[PDB]
Design a protein around this ligand. Structure first.
Ligand code: SF4
Lengths: 171, 1080, 26, 132, 87
DNA sequence: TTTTTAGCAGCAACA
DNA sequence: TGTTGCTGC
């Protein structure tokens, strides 16, 4: 069996980051110039990203309510013998591990590319009471990166109305 | 121009989908405003004006003109117009020959004038009934239909449907089946509260409002309460539930309320969703708004209605908790937001203790904001995945708006559907049934009458497992019957179940010979000890199918009189189907002379006037309402009956017979048949769509996400017709509803009880039935039994055969088919055809890996409606009774139940399974027998902890007194909805458990405070030890766990005759005696 | 000396995702 | 600001050493998750000295007071952790869906080092029992 | 006549609030207390009454008594809510 | 003021 | 030992 010990003081520098399959492939590549780099625009405000040589992920910390202890194996400096308590199913000790860190969070990586809706729709409907389509699409791209149907993007404030072949946008 | 709905695109005005409808008064004339999320547009309303109306019935059709002149002259102050009309009345003799009741239609300018006409006519009806053209007025009909429901029925306008609004009225489109996407807001609110109390809107503030709009998240924070500025963050609990939250840090509670009302005006939501916001959120916002001098109705259009529910004109209020209570099929222990999120969205939301919310606004406001946005995300995705598609689908068929469609009881939804169908067939609606205030049986006063409902049996108790052997004792004569029935049962499976012809089936004799061999081997070797097949056989839509098969409606149940008055009543008549039902009275043992003696005694007593601003404080007995007279009679009869007869009630069951007309106008049953077929239609369409969602390419975003929403849609119209059908099945006993039919309900139940007892009596001869509940039988069959087969058609398609199912269905069709069903082939000549109708089929579910059934502590008695069932993969398929899933309860029993259920999948025999389960029982007994000196103190606390919530504290609480009541009072002494977390203390010895309930929060309190209250609560002034283990009643917790062990395990094995696997928990003395008398 | 134990949480909870600043690491 | 992750040493050690066979990597690592709070003493140097010599429940190693808080016995997928004299935890070795990775932020030199990559975890989801 | 006036005809909320503030000042100048008579006894609508009852001195006409009582009940609840807000 | 039904488990009191 | 109430399946 392995005896589990704990130190009075943990090193808080050790943190857990989730490694997706793609991250694993990147990690096992000695070829890269730059392997991975943590980047941020500033120290106090901007988000922190994780970058490979050709892709960028934004980091998000996710706290959990459990006690998570990482143990590393160690070789005791002096031979130490422990008493047997009423413990059942105990093999001879062969190595020793110590919980050296206590982590409360993980770092998730989400792929990312390395203004008021109602007002913008109001001004769009203004200059032109009735708008085309291919004409209005590049005008509304800027409001919601939610990846939606362009009609839904428009219906956030202005409204569509059809006729024979054309569909115009009014209110 | 010429009106034709085929040329709709030339038709003028505007097309739109009707999202919201309300009754209005226009410049007053009555009208309905209709709100169209509309296509293309953001929205637009349009108004339909229509005269409110009702009917007068006459007793003599020869003098209708004398009644017409009377009512013109008597109602001149309020009547707009009058017209003589004709309707079919199914209570009229010979209406089945086209005889229609003559009626006077009274029409009004508005609903107020209609109500005054009712106030003028009601005295004439009361004089005529108790004591001239006045005596020709029989009754008023259709006078109580809601006005918007009237316009929706009479114009066929339905929410969820698309219409073109034109001068002539509303025209239903047909090309657009998909809903429009309304702007959907969903919100939740976080409030301050005092320790151990509920929030009070008079003193407590709103801390935050979390919301989502169409998938974007928002949080408003009140910076008087929230200590830091919260930054924009993501709460995405799954990749299918994104939640990006933009934060509005507002200076105070009034800026928070103004921002919330401003943002509602900007986005113009046509749906607002909440979780329980009818009774917390909106009441709180509205009271805080009133304290700050804001009028929430003039700000956003929201006000409390006559029920105290929050509503607007333009926007529907979709309280998800209404759907959770009515439609989700969740038991009441799983109806709180977290347990709904776990059971429906399949994740754990964030969970905060309500006592930590107000502290965390100052100490950890980021973690409070994470909790608040979690409940907005949970509410938004609960609405969009479940409530939205379900409610708008119901609106496409029901003449109600979304708010009423969410909130009315299911039997009222049946009433509206039956009113549409009766109106479309020109049938006259019945008046609402009024229960007689008293009834008598054999000169005894009835307390209540009813029928014998669904049949339920608990036959065996034990562990049954696909890998453990069971003894079978097959009746060889049942196998001889099955061998003789086999050719016609297989033909029936091709012709009736699979709707094909035997001539197309290439392997018919191969399948027949394979089943014949297995049956012959089971006949010769009729005593076997082999593995089981664990099956459930259940009747598809049982009561609806009994109703359609027997042509059961309340439009047919005829007396011998109405049957004798009918011109179709000849020698040789086939159309009078006689069916049995079991009536059940509960009556007082007292006779009519004793009743009259009690009445004469009460006439000498004096009673308080239920009058308020009124004056006369005292009434005599005869000055009371007849309902109040009978309430006082029933009270004195309960005392008298108990004193003279030593019992309060007698109950008696009488088998009765009733006549079901087959020739009677088909409108009820046609609604049921047609509704059943449309649901089947959508199940079919569903399957075709399932094939479409997989056949195609995998580029998920390639204009095929419209196809998947419509899949949810047809599923939803399927579930919708489903609820509507099972409801018709109930509605018919809806006291106070129309089309009521207490009989019909008794026939439906007794026919069902007879079908399931017939099925059980076969299954008991070829296998072992374990439990029977109404429409379902749980059984074990021998593993050698004939099971699943496939017929091969000439076109290479395979038809499915389940022999255990088809052998039952064949016997159901030979015994319960209606060879008297009549249908009207020629409506001009009143020609009826007679055919054979039966729609009653078992379905089969399984085979299953394991089933666990509990036994009683009483000798010879099973426990009905309690079991646990497991799939072949070891997943928990179905459960019955049990706890844990409940709000509060004792945490020890929840953790024990979480561990124990998965372990019933272990072991290769029934004894081996009970031994693995007994290992876990002993481990959980060791924790208690060791006084839980192990583990950590706080953990012992939680597990031992029992939690209970109080509904409304206040005076309900000055009221009763008990353990929680004791915990709440002890929290009040120390520090609606309060969570009473408590333990039970050993001291005072011999005191009731309700006086030994100590709040757990005392263990975390300062040693002087802890000492003073523990001394006062244990009645021990000398208590110096303050360890939680010496305070706890370990004997009480050991009895609680021992009683869970008895119910879930010791019983099963010992009830099935296997030795007791947990000897540290003894059997009850009746069960010990029952085992000893079984082994002797 | 025998005062080491686990105060059992009745159910597993995973908290809200949070953004990370440079100071969050150091 | 910006800083690289140094993963050369872990990578070289990974390529030159065999594939991970058991729950413990060749470099000797293990994680652990407990549904609860591990209640430990607030001080250790003072309390490590009063532990009698026979028990050795609080040992001293290289000037650090380590507490012997339990024992682990791995039987296939099943695993048991004994804590103190009064706690027994039953759990399982589960293969991680997402291989976790431990790193190390050297604030001093502004260097980041990849320490190791996990593939398994030992989870204990049931209420602790006495050691019997 | 000022207390019995139909405030339901006034669409302008600001003007309704100003009149209600003046009426609260008049009720205070005459020391007219709004008492909730809870002598109803059946938890439905405890009628609000003015103490002293000016109604018994002013209302000579039995037809006007019934009309005024129905109008006053809705006004007195609004006035009580405003007196409680001011308190 | 609006409102589906009956059969059953089991805790706790009292006839 | 039985019935009766209540909650909730
Ligand atoms: S049984 Fe025949 S004759 Fe009698 S009421 Fe019914 S339809 Fe008429």
């Amino acid at each position: 069996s392995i005896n589990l010990h704990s130190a009075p003081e943990y090193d808080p520098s050790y943190k857990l980051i989730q490694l997706t399959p793609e991250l694993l492939d990147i990690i096992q590549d000695p070829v890269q110039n730059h392997q991975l780099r943590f980047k941020s625009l500033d120290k106090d405000k901007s988000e922190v990203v994780l970058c490979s040589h050709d892709k960028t992920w934004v980091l998000k910390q996710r706290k959990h309510s459990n006690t998570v202890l990482l143990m590393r194996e160690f070789v005791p400096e002096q031979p130490i013998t422990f008493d047997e308590t009423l413990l059942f199913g105990l093999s001879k000790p062969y190595m020793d591990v110590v919980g050296f860190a206590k982590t409360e969070s993980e770092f998730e990586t989400r792929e990312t590319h390395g203004m008021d809706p109602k007002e913008r729709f109001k001004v769009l409907f203004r200059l032109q009471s009735q708008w085309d389509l291919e004409d209005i699409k590049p005008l509304i791209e800027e409001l919601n990166s939610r990846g939606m149907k362009i009609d839904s993007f428009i219906m956030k404030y202005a409204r569509r109305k059809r006729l024979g072949k054309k569909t115009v946008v009014t209110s | 121009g010429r009106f034709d709905a085929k040329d709709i695109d030339q038709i003028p005005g505007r097309v739109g989908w009707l999202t919201n409808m309300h009754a209005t008064l226009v410049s007053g004339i009555s009208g309905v405003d209709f709100y169209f999320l509309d296509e293309e547009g953001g929205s637009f309303k349009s108004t339909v004006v229509y005269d409110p109306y009702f009917f007068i019935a006459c007793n003599d059709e020869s003098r209708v003109n004398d009644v017409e002149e009377l009512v013109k002259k008597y109602l001149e102050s309020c009547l707009k117009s009058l017209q003589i009309i004709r309707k079919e009345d199914l209570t009229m003799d010979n209406h089945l020959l086209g005889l229609q009741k003559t009626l006077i239609k009274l029409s009004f300018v508005n609903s107020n004038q209609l109500f005054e006409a009712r106030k003028l006519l009601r005295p004439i009806l009361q004089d005529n009934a108790n004591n001239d053209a006045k005596h020709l007025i029989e009754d008023i009909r259709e006078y109580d239909v809601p006005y918007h429901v009237r316009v929706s029925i009479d114009k066929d306008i339905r929410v969820g449907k698309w219409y073109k609004v034109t001068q002539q009225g509303f025209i239903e489109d047909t090309r657009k089946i998909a809903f429009a996407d309304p702007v959907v807001m969903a919100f939740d609110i976080e409030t301050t509260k005092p320790p151990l109390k509920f929030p009070d809107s008079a003193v407590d503030q709103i801390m935050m409002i979390s919301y989502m709009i169409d998938g974007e998240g928002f949080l408003i924070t009140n910076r008087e309460i929230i200590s830091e500025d919260i930054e924009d963050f993501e709460y995405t609990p799954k990749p299918e539930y994104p939640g990006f939250f933009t934060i509005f840090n507002e200076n105070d509670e009034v800026a928070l309320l103004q921002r919330f009302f401003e943002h509602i005006r900007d986005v113009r939501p046509t749906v607002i969703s909440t979780f329980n916001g009818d009774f917390f959120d909106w009441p709180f916002i509205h009271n805080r708004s009133k304290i700050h001098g804001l009028d929430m109705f003039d700000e956003i259009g929201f006000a409390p209605d006559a029920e105290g529910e929050y509503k607007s004109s333009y926007c529907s209020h979709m309280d998800c908790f209404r759907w959770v209570k009515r439609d989700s099929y969740l038991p009441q222990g799983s109806q709180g937001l977290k347990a709904v999120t776990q059971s429906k969205l399949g994740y754990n939301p964030i969970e905060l203790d309500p006592e930590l919310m107000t502290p965390y606004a100052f100490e950890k406001p980021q973690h409070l904001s994470e909790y608040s946005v979690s409940d907005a995300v949970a509410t938004y995705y609960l609405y969009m995945k479940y409530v939205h598609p379900f409610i708008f689908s119901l609106c496409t068929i029901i003449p109600l708006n979304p708010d009423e469609t969410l909130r009315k009881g299911t039997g009222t939804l049946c009433e509206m559907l039956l009113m549409v169908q009766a109106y479309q067939h020109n049938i006259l609606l019945p008046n609402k049934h009024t229960d007689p205030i008293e009834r008598f049986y054999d000169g005894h006063l009835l307390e209540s009458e009813t029928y014998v409902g669904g049949h339920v049996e608990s036959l065996e108790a034990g562990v049954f497992r696909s890998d453990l052997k069971n003894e079978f004792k097959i009746d060889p004569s049942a196998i001889d019957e099955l061998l003789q029935e086999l050719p016609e049962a297989l033909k029936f499976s091709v012709e009736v179940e699979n709707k094909s012809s035997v001539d197309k089936v290439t392997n018919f004799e191969e399948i027949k010979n394979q089943i014949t061999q297995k049956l012959l081997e089971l006949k010769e070797n009729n005593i076997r000890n082999e593995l089981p097949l664990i099956y459930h056989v259940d009747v598809a839509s049982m009561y609806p199918n009994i109703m359609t098969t027997n042509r059961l409606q309340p439009d047919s149940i005829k007396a011998e009189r109405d049957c004798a008055s009918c011109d179709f009543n000849r020698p040789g008549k086939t159309c009078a189907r006689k069916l049995k039902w079991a009536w059940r009275g509960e009556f007082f043992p007292s006779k009519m002379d004793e009743y009259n003696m009690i009445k004469r005694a009460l006439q000498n007593e004096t009673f308080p006037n239920k009058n308020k601003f009124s004056k006369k404080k005292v009434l005599t007995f005869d000055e009371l309402s007849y309902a109040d007279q009978v309430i006082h009679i029933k009270k004195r009869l309960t005392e008298y009956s108990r004193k003279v007869y030593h019992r309060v009630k007698v109950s008696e069951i009488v088998e009765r017979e009733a006549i079901v007309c087959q020739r009677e106008n088909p409108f009820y049953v046609d609604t049921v048949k047609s509704f059943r077929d449309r649901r089947y239609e959508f199940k079919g369409l569903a399957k075709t769509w399932k094939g479409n969602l997989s056949k195609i390419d995998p580029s998920d975003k390639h204009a095929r996400d419209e196809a998947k929403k419509m899949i949810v849609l047809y599923d939803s119209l399927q579930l919708a017709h489903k609820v509507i059908l099972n409801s018709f099945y109930g509605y018919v006993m809806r006291k106070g509803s129309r089309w009521y039919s207490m009989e019909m309900a008794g026939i439906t139940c007794l026919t069902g009880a007879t079908i399931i007892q017939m099925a059980r009596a076969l299954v008991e001869r070829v296998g072992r039935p374990l439990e029977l509940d109404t429409d379902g039988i749980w059984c074990i069959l021998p593993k050698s039994f004939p099971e699943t087969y496939f017929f091969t058609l000439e076109n290479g398609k395979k038809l499915y055969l389940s022999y255990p199912c088809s052998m039952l269905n064949y016997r159901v069709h030979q015994k319960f088919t209606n060879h008297q069903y009549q249908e009207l082939k020629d409506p001009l000549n009143y020609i009826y055809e007679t055919h054979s109708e039966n729609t009653i089929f078992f379905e089969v579910d399984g085979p299953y890996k394991a089933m666990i059934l509990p036994s009683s502590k009483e000798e010879g008695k099973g426990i009905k409606k309690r079991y646990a069932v497991f799939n072949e993969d070891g997943s928990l398929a179905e459960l019955k009774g049990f706890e844990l899933k409940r709000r509060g309860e004792l945490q020890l029993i929840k953790n024990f139940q979480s561990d124990i259920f998965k372990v019933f999948l272990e072991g290769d025999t029934l004894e081996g399974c009970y031994s693995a389960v007994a290992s876990v029982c002993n481990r959980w007994l060791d924790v208690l027998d060791s006084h839980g000196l192990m583990l950590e103190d706080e953990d012992l606390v939680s597990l031992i902890c029992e939690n209970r919530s109080m509904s409304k504290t206040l005076k309900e609480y000055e009221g009763q007194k008990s353990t929680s009541i004791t915990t709440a009072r002890r929290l009040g002494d120390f520090l609606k909805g309060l969570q009473c977390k408590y333990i039970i203390s050993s001291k005072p010895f011999n005191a009731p458990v309700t006086e030994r309930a100590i709040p757990v929060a005392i263990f975390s309190a300062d040693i002087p405070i802890k000492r003073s209250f523990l001394r006062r609560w244990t009645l021990d002034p000398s208590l110096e030890d303050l360890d939680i283990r010496t305070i706890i009643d370990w004997g009480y917790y050991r009895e609680r766990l021992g009683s869970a062990i008895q119910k879930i395990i010791t019983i099963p094995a010992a009830l099935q005759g296997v030795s007791n696997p947990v000897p540290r928990v003894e059997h009850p003395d009746w069960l010990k005696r029952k085992i000893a008398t079984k082994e002797d | 000396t025998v005062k080491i134990w686990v105060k059992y949480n009745e159910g597993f909870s995973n908290a809200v995702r949070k953004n990370v600043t440079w100071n969050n690491l150091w | 600001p910006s800083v690289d992750i140094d993963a050369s040493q872990w990578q070289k050690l990974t390529q030159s050493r065999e594939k991970q066979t058991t729950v413990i990597t060749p470099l000797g690592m293990m994680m652990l998750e407990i549904q609860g709070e591990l209640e430990l003493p607030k001080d250790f140097a003072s309390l490590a000295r009063r532990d009698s010599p026979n028990e050795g429940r609080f040992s001293e190693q290289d000037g650090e007071t380590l507490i012997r808080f339990g024992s682990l016995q791995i039987d296939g997928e099943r695993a048991t952790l004994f804590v103190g004299k009064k706690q027994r935890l039953l759990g399982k070795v589960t293969k991680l869906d997402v291989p976790m990775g431990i790193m190390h932020f050297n604030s001093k030199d502004n260097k980041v080092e990849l320490v190791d990559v996990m593939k398994y975890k030992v989870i204990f989801k049931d209420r602790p029992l006495p050691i019997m | 006549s000022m207390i019995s006036s139909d405030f339901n005809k006034i669409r302008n909320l600001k003007l309704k609030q100003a009149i209600m503030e003046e009426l609260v000042q008049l009720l205070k100048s005459f020391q007219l207390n709004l008492i909730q008579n809870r002598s109803e006894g059946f938890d439905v609508r405890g009628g609000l009454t003015i103490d002293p009852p000016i109604d018994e001195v002013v209302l000579l006409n039995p037809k006007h008594i019934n009309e005024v009582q129905h109008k006053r009940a809705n006004n007195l609840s609004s006035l009580l809510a405003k007196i409680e807000e001011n308190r």
